[PDB]
Structure formats: structure tokens, C-alpha cells
Amino acid sequence: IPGVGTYDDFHTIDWVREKCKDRERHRRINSKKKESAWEMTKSLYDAWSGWLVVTLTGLASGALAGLIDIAADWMTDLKEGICLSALWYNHEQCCWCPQWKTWAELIIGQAEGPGSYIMNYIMYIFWALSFAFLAVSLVKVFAPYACGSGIPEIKTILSGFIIRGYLGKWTLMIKTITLVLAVASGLSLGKEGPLVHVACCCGNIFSYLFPKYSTNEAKKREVLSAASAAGVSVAFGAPIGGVLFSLEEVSYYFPLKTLWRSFFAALVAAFVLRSINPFGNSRLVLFYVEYHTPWYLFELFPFILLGVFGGLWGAFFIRANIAWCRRRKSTKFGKYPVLEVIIVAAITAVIAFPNPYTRLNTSELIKELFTDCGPLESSSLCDYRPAGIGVYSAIWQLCLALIFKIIMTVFTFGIKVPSGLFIPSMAIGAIAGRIVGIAVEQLAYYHHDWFIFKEWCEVGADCITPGLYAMVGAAACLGGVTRMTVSLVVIVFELTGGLEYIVPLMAAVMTSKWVGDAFGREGIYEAHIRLNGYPFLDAKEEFTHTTLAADVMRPRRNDPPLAVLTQDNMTVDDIENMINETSYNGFPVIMSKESQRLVGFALRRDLTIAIESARKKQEGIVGSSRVCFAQHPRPLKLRSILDMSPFTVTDHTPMEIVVDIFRKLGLRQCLVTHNGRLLGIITKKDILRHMAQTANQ
Amino acid sequence: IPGVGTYDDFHTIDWVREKCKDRERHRRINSKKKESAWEMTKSLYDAWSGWLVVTLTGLASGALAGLIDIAADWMTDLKEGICLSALWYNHEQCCWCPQWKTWAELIIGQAEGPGSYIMNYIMYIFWALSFAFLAVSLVKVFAPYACGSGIPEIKTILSGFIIRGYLGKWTLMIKTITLVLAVASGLSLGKEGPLVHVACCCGNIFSYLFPKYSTNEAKKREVLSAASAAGVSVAFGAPIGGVLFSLEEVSYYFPLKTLWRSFFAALVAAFVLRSINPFGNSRLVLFYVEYHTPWYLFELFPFILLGVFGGLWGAFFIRANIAWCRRRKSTKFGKYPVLEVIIVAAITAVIAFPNPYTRLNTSELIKELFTDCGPLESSSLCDYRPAGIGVYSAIWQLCLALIFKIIMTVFTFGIKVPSGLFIPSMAIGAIAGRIVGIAVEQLAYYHHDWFIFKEWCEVGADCITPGLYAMVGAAACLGGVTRMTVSLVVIVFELTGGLEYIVPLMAAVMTSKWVGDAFGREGIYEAHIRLNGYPFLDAKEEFTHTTLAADVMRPRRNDPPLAVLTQDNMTVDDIENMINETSYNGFPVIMSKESQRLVGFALRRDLTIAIESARKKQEGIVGSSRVCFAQHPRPLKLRSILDMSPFTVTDHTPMEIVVDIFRKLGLRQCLVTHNGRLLGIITKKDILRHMAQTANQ
């Protein structure tokens, strides 16, 4: 019957049923292939559909990432001036500087002086405000789903949740435009994490072109996992890192074939980015900073210390941001998203313009911090490198920036614009690591008499490398705020290329994960999932409460008896009334009202669809005709919509085993029986609600 | 009761029961921790036990790998002479060459001449024969399990199979000695793959030191997965590659925490190898060959061609080796393992000595082939690089070697000595890729007028890099013979460090996997698992036969009724007689012989152990006392050994869902019932046998 087997919005899919549908389609297609040669070519196309869709998703993700990077760089450069000779060229490419003219030279006509500084300040603020206004208005008017990182929603979707329109074309376009707008605005956010959502949108749009991936939910989830891998790859140019992230972060179920498919998609996207090098390649992709000297054993001490910082700040953020977000979801603050975005952008621009580090783009700041001092470098971060008073000043200039980055982010992650949390955390950790490395280098230079320095360092030698400390701090902050261990480390290593610095990174990361784990085992993405109330049966959480299945059945003593359907003692009108009277997703069809022996399970959606189709197709089905759910007045027959083998457990079964079954098999509901007689039903909603109750939420 | 919950040799574990035991122990330990501060310290130790065991396993694996490499290098160098000045020094380190003296100089007294060549030939053959004899005798006399790679057995074990003594200390020591002996003998084998078994042995030996990992099988399997990751890491110096290999090859179930634990163990082992650099670091670990020029798009054509070769040869090997192995398991050839090893070693030495490439160590040959021609290099492989006649001769010298390497391996993988298949396949692929690269370079140099070469190459330019072709060929052969895609590619990339050659590798690998997949979807390890007859329910295989649970129940119409135990209508003597009369692993305890309603499941081992313990502990239990399985003449009580919630499915349930339940939940048996009455039992053995029957085995 047409329509049978579909799902509604904000519903969970049944993986077993979807896979049964997929293999039934596979058997039918194989039979057709053996039937004819044209069907054989169709079967070959069906087999190659997965490769085709993953390749298309990778190519689209790479192209979109390149375009977004180019547009964001140009728009960010527009704030501080423009290149009259070539308006399309950005500041860096325009000066590759008489061609570049600042707003002071174009309005006041003076390149220097207090008036020039004032004009530049006002123009910077105005451009930031305009970009923020455009981004928020576009998000609110066209695609409200384009707001946020999207990683929490993608995680919920890959678990089996349905969010219609989240991965649509409208959301893709609006997010693509608004991410560039927000990045140019200068808000404390990034465009690396959100790229995963863009890749997922592309994956869905391409999956619509293949019947195998367009009529089955599980195959769509596999394509989405590959898309997420490709998105991370384009974000950080780390295809292996992207595959690991898909494996450990967003993919609830990851078949082995999906591993290689996601790896191929990530490699294709990385190759697409390489082809347009350096046009669409970001600074992070082109980082490629060489190392001066190898790390040393004693240096692991400050690194671990950095880890502690990464463990602490992230925890604080998880406690702060969430709380603020909750206030936005409870008070009137959420009724004025445009005003909130405008105010945040104004404050950020005003407080960031005076300080060169904050006025600097976050990605460029990260690149500079990771970049090591050189003989040709004369930046304030490397003016001293003996050392002078300016060092202290430099440290001061860093410290303030750090504080700024810590504050704005808390009020920036959650606003109604595309915002990413990877870049801000990386910048904060990089600043902290740079400060720590500067301190360690100064101590080594002024106290080389210590046996540790005298053994592992030499007078007038590059024993200490602050760039490595900044990298370690960035990795520690990312791990402490996301609780990622392997994917994070591999992504950092691929981004920086420091194969010899994998050990220094890992350690720090682990430390952060432990420290944060002391203040809470939940990460930022999971915390946001819980805040939004999405149905998520996280496997990381362990159910320790000693309860039995009898304690979770909905039809309790106080509750009314569960609605059931007789095999062949029901009519179409009665079934319609039952559907319109009960709120159950499905109903268990029993043999008889006395025996109450389970016969099957019929979903309400399929039941209604079958009834309507039969009424519109045949004559005499006006309610008088009976409905028979058994096998072979024109009585209605609805055996095709019922499940012959619903999962069942005993009333005394410990709830831990039930949760295990639900997690591993991805079931939708389980019929709790005893003596072969139906008693109750435990649904994923009930399991989640019980888990929340036992967790004191 | 002591002894309850144990397993016998060659038996499969029940993952659900083990995990229940583990969490019950966790709850008890948490209660004790809350009881006292000493118990709190004990709880901290229990929590840190996993980190401690993985760290110990990594350290032991690294140390053993270094020692094995050093010993193998020295023993191999001993065959062609000795360093009189420093007998402990090897040929390369002795000449770092008056100090080094060949056997001709030490016996005949003439360094050059036909007599010197004859003496060197005879001494080489004698040393190879002696090493082979020692290895085979040690394997056959002390640890028969030390033979082979061990990857198939490790894969079976990680799926829940029990092989007592496979990972013991005796096996570890014997394999460690015999791997070095066999490598020195010159047989067509390697010591990289077998290192995984060494790591697993270390992991088991260390897991014996922690009660959490000593009393639970699943935790031991997690430790073994970490050990396998560390073993691969030490084998190829690719901790990420080792983690991926553990994820995709040997680990049936891989918890998320086990991922980070395995990564940490691999990193620790790699760091241990680094600390002893270059003493215990193999040539593969110290490969680190720089790259001259980047690869080009047209070069992807021959690379794919190499993939085809890798796809073909491997398939052939899977068809040849297995067959020969089957002959060794059916004819009298298997009755003389020592003689077979001696004959194979004699033939290999005799046929390899004349040709310099075969006389050369396989690892050194791989390093040379991957190594690119340089101005200071004057080797025959790079004598020409215009080109002369010698090129052809060089190619000839390669071609013969290739054929040799293809033949001996077929007769070498399966003998009663520690043998690895990674190194031979890598060498074969490297030779093929070197030949292909030489041909392509010659064509480009003599036919640069072609638009392709004129566009992507220049006159007198290093457009073609034969080392990259050799690397691609090695990767293709490895993928074709093992059907590994992501782990293989990452391992190769980490080994070579060519982050810019990931795309050329991947493609080729994929091609091989496809080509081999056309001649059979099973790899060498799975083929050997099937040949040995181990019980393996591979998840990669898909069950498409449309059968129901009723078709797999053992108690069929022809078979006798299933043995059952009444709840409280049985005696100790009757239960003992039933145990000694039936071969079932466990028996279903029913409420009554008339109702036949399932009450629980009692394992034969636990039943016998409980009966014996009760008889030896209490008085009056002499068979007259009744046995009651219900809850509360001194009747025996055996409720603690009975499972209250055995998994059950309906008789009409499709067998596909049953296979899914068995694979995902790792069950041991499922009770098939109808109307709430027990009918039959489907065990993993029956599922495996039905799968074999449906596969026409």
C-alpha cells in the first residue's frame, strides 16, 4: 500500500524494519537483474549508487568550503578598508601598499592621526553591525534551522531522529550565506564546525537522487556519516581526522563499508580543496609550519599543566554557556534574537578594535600564535626574540585577549546565527600555550644553570618552542570542551603536520578529558542536546539502576488498560476510532480478548494509510466491512502493515538488558509479556524518560 | 559457588553474562569504596587497572619488538660472515671492511675466486638449514601454538572463542625465539604480522595481574584489542594505523573507551621503540625516505594498473596457499613438519643465493626498492640513473626475483614455524611497482614528445619516481591479499611519511580490493579461519537465505525431545544422570512437564559444579535430596546457577533477525518458543553450521 512504512516529523526510525526493507529491495533487484540485461545494468547502477553519492557529497563539500573561505576572507578584509586598484582582491592579496586604502583615507582623507583612528573605529563597528544584522535577518526570515553549529542536531539525527527540513536546500543556502556573514562580522565564532552541517545537507540532497538512499532511512544515515567525515576533512584538511570524528562523535551506527566510503569522500573533498590551492584553502589548511627542534621530556610538565587549563576552562564553559542558553529559553531574552545579536556584535567590535590581537581575525591569530619566531619576523609576539621590558607588555596584550575570548564566546554560542565553537576554543588554548611557552623560555634563558635546562637545553639554543606550547594548549582546550581524544589528536596532527609531536598532544588532551570529567562527564554537544530536549539514548551513559521491565511498562495499575486490536473481530470504523482516540505510535494486535496472546504489532500511521487506501480503492469499505489481520462483505485485510515478530522481554527482565537491546538493535518498542500473554509496551521515549528520572534531571 | 561461571577449552563466551558479572563487581566495589577509605584506595586502583595494563602491554611489546629486530638482524648478518673485531657487531655496524670476514676467508683463506663463492654458498645453505631446524624443533617440542601468524586465531578469540594456552608465557617465549630463528633462516616470511600475537600474549600475561581483567572475559578481549593495536604499531611504527587495524580487522566488539586505550598503548610502544633508536628500530621504522617531486594526475593510470596486479596475485595466493594447506591437512605431508621445513629452507636458500635481490634480506630489499635513485647511489637498480643495456638486465634480475617471491611464499605460509605474510606481499608489490616505474620512466624519457609527458613532465626532469610506484605496488598487494582499505592505507602512509601520496595509495588499494572481490570476498585470514574450522560468525558475511527459526531448532521431528529440568521435581542423582547423558552445553529449566513454560536456563558446567560443591559442603545431599530451582531433607537449591531471563524468539521469526541478535548481542543460545511454551534451542554452533550449509561449503 502506498505510504505504508513512512515516518512523521520528530520521530525515531526502527533500524530493523529499515534494514529488512533494504534487503527485500536488494533481493527484488537481484531477481530483476537475473531477469534481463537492462535490469543487470540497473543493478550495476544501484551497486555504484553509494560510491556516486559519496563522491558527489565530497565534491560539493570541498567546493562549498572553498567558496565560503574565499568569501569570508574578502568580507573580513573589507572591514578595515578596500583595494581601489582591484576591489575583488583582499588586503593580503592586494598588497602582495598604495593600492589598499583605509576608510580614513577614503572619508577623511588622512591616513594617520586621531581622526583616522576614530574613522577606522567607527567604520569597523558599522561593518560588524551590518554583517551581524544581515546574518540574523537572513536566518530568521528564510531558514531558522541554519542557526548554531548543527553538530548536536546531526548527532541526534544519526541516532535515528527525524528533523524534516534541517538538511534541506533552503537551510544549506541560508547557512552558507550567513556563516560567511557572521564570520566577517567578527563575532566569537568559527566556520569549521558548521561545515559539517553543510556537508550533511549536501549528502541528503544527493541521496535524493538514488532510490536506495532515498527510500531507506539507515542508508541515508550512512550517507550522512560519510558527509560528516567529509565536512570535518574540509574544515581541517584531515581526512583521517574526519573519519575518526565520524566514527567516535556523530555516528551512532557505523558499518565497516561506511568507514571506507567516508574515507573516500573525505579524500575526494581534500583533493578538491587541493586543486584550487591556495584560492579556497584557509590558513589552517595551509598552516604548514616547520619545526625547529624536537620536544624534550621535561617539557611534558608544562604541557600537562596546559591540559589542566584545557580541562578547567571547558568545564566552566559547559557550566556557563548552557546556563545562559537556558536563560534565553526561559526569559524574554529569547523574544529579541535580532537585538541580542546586534548588541553582542556591537560589544565585541568595540572591545576588540583597540587590542590588535582581538581586532585580528581568529584564524589569522591562531596561525600567528602557532607560527614560531624567526629572524625575519618582527612581530610584537617575537620582538624580543635577550629579552626586554616589552615582553611583559606583550604578555599583557595576550592576557587581556584571552579574557576577552573567554567571555564573548559564552554569550556568542547560542545566538540565532551560524556559530562554531572549534575556532574560539583553539584560539583560547593557543593564547594560553603561547603565554606558557614564553614563560618557560624566559625561565630557561635566565635560569639555564638548573640541571634540567643544562642537560636538555644549551646556552643560546632554541630548546623551548612556544608554537608547540600554543598547539598543545589549543588541543587541550578543544579536548576539554568537546571531550574528544583520538579524533581530536589526529585532526590536530594532520592540521599541523607535527608527526613528532603526537605524544605531547595526546597527553595534554587526556589530562583535559580527566579534569573536565571530574566536573561532569557530558560534553558541550551532549549538554546542548539535553538542553534542547531531543530524544537521545546516548551509549556513553551507563544505566546502573536495578529496575525490571515491569517498572517501565506504561499500562500500570493507575493507568488504563492498553489498547489492543483483535485479529478478525474488528471493523474499519472501530479501528479508525481507536486510532483517533489513542496516542500510541502503534498498537499490539492480539489473537483474542480472552487469550490475549500476541499476534503482531500494527503502526498507527500504516494502519490509517492502509484503511484510507482500501476505502479509496475498493467498494464496500465504509466501516461495516470487517478488518481481518489473519492470513488468507469484502472485509478489509491489513496483514501487510503488521509485524509478525515484535521484540518481547519478560516482566522480570532487568532494565539494563532492555536498554542494551534498544541501543544495539535500535528498536522502537518492546512488548513486555509473561506466560505468553501481552502485558505492556516499553518504548524508547519511556526508556529515555526513566533514564532522566534516574539521573535526577 | 566456587567455579560457577567458568568456561571450558574451545568454547564461546556469553558477552551479556560477562558484562553483567562485570557491572555486579563494579557495584560491589563501589559499595566497598563508600564503606571505607582503604576500600576507596582499592577502588582507585581498580579504576586505574585498565591504564596500568595497557601501559604494561605497550612497554612489553615495544621492548620485545626491539629485541627481536636486533637479534634477527644479527643472525641474518651471521650467514654471510662475521666481524672478528667485534663478534657482537653486525655487518652493517661492523663496516660503519677489514673487520668483517666472510666464511671463505675464515675457511679457505681466499676472499675472491670460485672457491670463495662455493664456500660462501655452502655456508649460507648450512646456516639457513640450521636456523630452520632449530626453529621447527623448538616450535614442535615446547609450544606448538607458536606456529603461524596468529592473526586468524586472535580474530577468533576476540569474537569470544576460547583457546587455552595460545596466549600463554610458553607460547610467547617460544614464538619470540623462533620468529628470530626463522627470519634469520631466510624463509619467505616476516616478523611484522606475528608481533601482534606477541603483543596479545603480553596483554594476557599482564591482565592476569588485575582481578577486573582476570575474572571477566570481555575485559580480557578489550585488553587483547589494545595489545593488537600496540603490536601493529611496533610492527610498522603506525599507532594510528595499529588503532585502525584493531578497529577493522581483529576486534569483533570495540567499545569507545577501548579506542583511546588502544591508541595510548600504541603510542607508548612507539615511544619505547623511539627511546632505543636506532638500536631496536627496524629499517621499516627508520625508512624516512624524502620525496623528489609530487605525483601527477596521469601517473594515476599505472597506479590503478598496479592495483589490478595486487588484486590478482592476492586472489591467486588465496586460491593456492589454502589449497596447499588443505593438502597438508589431508595427506601424509603433515606427518613430517620438520622434514618439510628443512626441504623448504634448503630450496629457498639454494634458489635465492645466486640472485642478489633474493639473497638480500626481504626488509632490506623493500627499503632499497622504496628508496629513490640518487647522485651518490651506484646500485644496479640505479646504475642507469640516459639509459643503457644494463637497464634490461636489471629488469630481468627483478623479474626472476618476483617469480621466486610468488612461489616460495605459497609453500612457506603454513609450515610449523612463526611466519608472517605482510613482508612477502610488500616485497612482491614493491618489485612489481619498481618494474612498472622503470618502464614508465623509460617511456617518458624516450617519448617526451607526447602531449601528456610534455605537459606533466619536462626534459631532464624527475617527473617519474619509481619509489612511489614500488610503494603503491606494495600497498596494492597487501590490500589484495588482506582486503584491508583504511588501516592498510594509514599504515603505509605512517610507515613512509608520504602525506602527499595518500590519494595515489588509496585508489590502488581500492582497485585491488575490487579485483580480488571478483574472485572471492574472503581474505587470507578468514580463509585460514574457515580451513582450521574455528567457530567464527563473521559480520561481513550477510545471511540472505529466507529461513525461519523453526528450521534451525535442534529438537526436530526426527530428533528426540529436548532435555528439560523441572523446577522442584528433580533430584541430584537425576540431574547428574541427565548431565552425563546429554551433550547440551545447557538445559532449559521449565515450570512443569505439562505446562512446559520456560523458567530459566542452567549451564551444565555450573550445574555440575554446584552439585559437587553442595555435596562436599552440606550433609544429606547423596542423591536422595531433591533439587529446587525455585526461589525461597535439605533439598539442594541451584537457583543461583539459573538464568531468569534467557533470550527467546518466536518459531516464525526469520533467521536473519536471529543472526542479527546473535552477532550484535553476542549470545550463546536462544530459546525458540510459541504460545509461551518452550519448543527448541538455537545455538551459535547451529547458526554457524546452517550458514555453512547455505554457503555450499
Ligand SMILES: CC(C)CCC[C@@H](C)[C@H]1CC[C@H]2[C@@H]3CC=C4C[C@@H](O)CC[C@]4(C)[C@H]3CC[C@]12C
Ligand atoms: C554588506 C556587503 C555584502 C556589501 C558588499 C559590497 C561592498 C563591498 C560595496 C558596497 C558599497 C561599495 C562602495 C560604493 C562606492 C565606492 C566609491 C568608489 O570611488 C570606490 C569604491 C566604493 C568605496 C565601493 C566599494 C565597495 C562597496 C563598499
Ligand SMILES: CC(C)CCC[C@@H](C)[C@H]1CC[C@H]2[C@@H]3CC=C4C[C@@H](O)CC[C@]4(C)[C@H]3CC[C@]12C
Ligand atoms: C599533576 C599536577 C601537575 C596536577 C596539579 C593540579 C591538581 C591539583 C588538580 C588536577 C585535577 C584537580 C581536581 C579536578 C576536579 C575536582 C573535583 C571537585 O569537585 C573538587 C576538586 C577536584 C578534586 C580537583 C582538585 C585539584 C586537582 C587534583
Ligand SMILES: CC(C)CCC[C@@H](C)[C@H]1CC[C@H]2[C@@H]3CC=C4C[C@@H](O)CC[C@]4(C)[C@H]3CC[C@]12C
Ligand atoms: C645457531 C646460532 C644460534 C649460533 C650462535 C653462535 C654463533 C654466532 C657462534 C657459534 C660458533 C662460533 C664460532 C666458533 C669459533 C670461531 C673461531 C674464532 O677464531 C673466530 C670466531 C668463530 C668463527 C666463532 C664465531 C661465532 C660462532 C659462529
Ligand SMILES: CC(C)CCC[C@@H](C)[C@H]1CC[C@H]2[C@@H]3CC=C4C[C@@H](O)CC[C@]4(C)[C@H]3CC[C@]12C
Ligand atoms: C580500467 C582498466 C585499466 C582495467 C583493465 C583490467 C580489466 C580488463 C580487468 C579488471 C577487473 C577484471 C575482472 C575481475 C574479475 C572477473 C571475474 C572472473 O570470473 C571473470 C573475469 C572478470 C570479469 C575480470 C575481467 C577483466 C577485468 C575487468
Ligand SMILES: [Cl-]
Ligand atoms: Cl568553528
Ligand SMILES: [Cl-]
Ligand atoms: Cl562547533
Ligand SMILES: [Cl-]
Ligand atoms: Cl610479516
Ligand SMILES: [Cl-]
Ligand atoms: Cl601475517
